Design a protein around this ligand. Sequence first.
Ligand SMILES: O=C1N=C(c2ccccc2)CC=C1O
Ligand SMILES: O=C1N=C(c2ccccc2)CC=C1O
Ligand SMILES: O=C1N=C(c2ccccc2)CC=C1O
Ligand SMILES: [Mn+2]
Ligand SMILES: [Mn+2]
Ligand SMILES: [Mn+2]
Length: 200
Amino acid sequence: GPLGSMEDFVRQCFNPMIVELAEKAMKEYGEDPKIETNKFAAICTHLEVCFMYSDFHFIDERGESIIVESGDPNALLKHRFEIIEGRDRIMAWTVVNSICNTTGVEKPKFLPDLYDYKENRFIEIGVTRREVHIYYLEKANKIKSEKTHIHIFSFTGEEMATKADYTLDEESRARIKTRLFTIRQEMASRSLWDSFRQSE
Ligand SMILES: O=C1N=C(c2ccccc2)CC=C1O
Ligand SMILES: O=C1N=C(c2ccccc2)CC=C1O
Ligand SMILES: O=C1N=C(c2ccccc2)CC=C1O
Ligand SMILES: [Mn+2]
Ligand SMILES: [Mn+2]
Ligand SMILES: [Mn+2]
């Protein structure tokens, strides 16, 4: 079929909030979304996975973690996850320092992606077009925080997480994997996938 543009794909398949946050992030690190378009799609994808990872997860009135998929969560509920990725560096570290001073959890060297109030730990989210073990080792070598939990997703449904601790229920992670599958399929229908996979 005809080759589409990755730009068109990203604008059409991702929520504008996500697209906007991704553009601001790329701009901040001096990369242009209109040139680094595969990177642009990868950044939107990673952001979306971070949001989906926290979606619907709350801490209840008793302090137990629960899932609430209705539009209206009970007002006494607390979000289970703090989202760190997608915030400018100043606000991101402000949130990190807050969490650290509040919970007692040690401060990370690099900005992680999430904080889990149930498991009491920061999380680094990875999304890869390559083999998950390879990508896992690269991120572990980068951060080496060793308190920061790592959770890798691939576009073909594989996962790898620190100590074989996957944090979320199968259903939550299946939502994420299904989304990645749809992204891959749609890219392929626009003949964007081969270039996107190999560009990582
Ligand atoms: O949102 C981010 N984007 C990054 C980026 C952007 C363009 C090229 C390489 C890394 C790095 C770290 C982030 O938190
Ligand atoms: O995720 C980031 N978002 C940034 C951002 C977000 C909104 C407005 C300006 C910069 C800056 C750096 C990041 O790593
Ligand atoms: O895991 C991350 N990967 C990023 C990324 C992904 C693809 C291309 C450029 C940056 C940005 C921020 C992260 O936490
Ligand atoms: Mn960022
Ligand atoms: Mn991040
Ligand atoms: Mn990440």
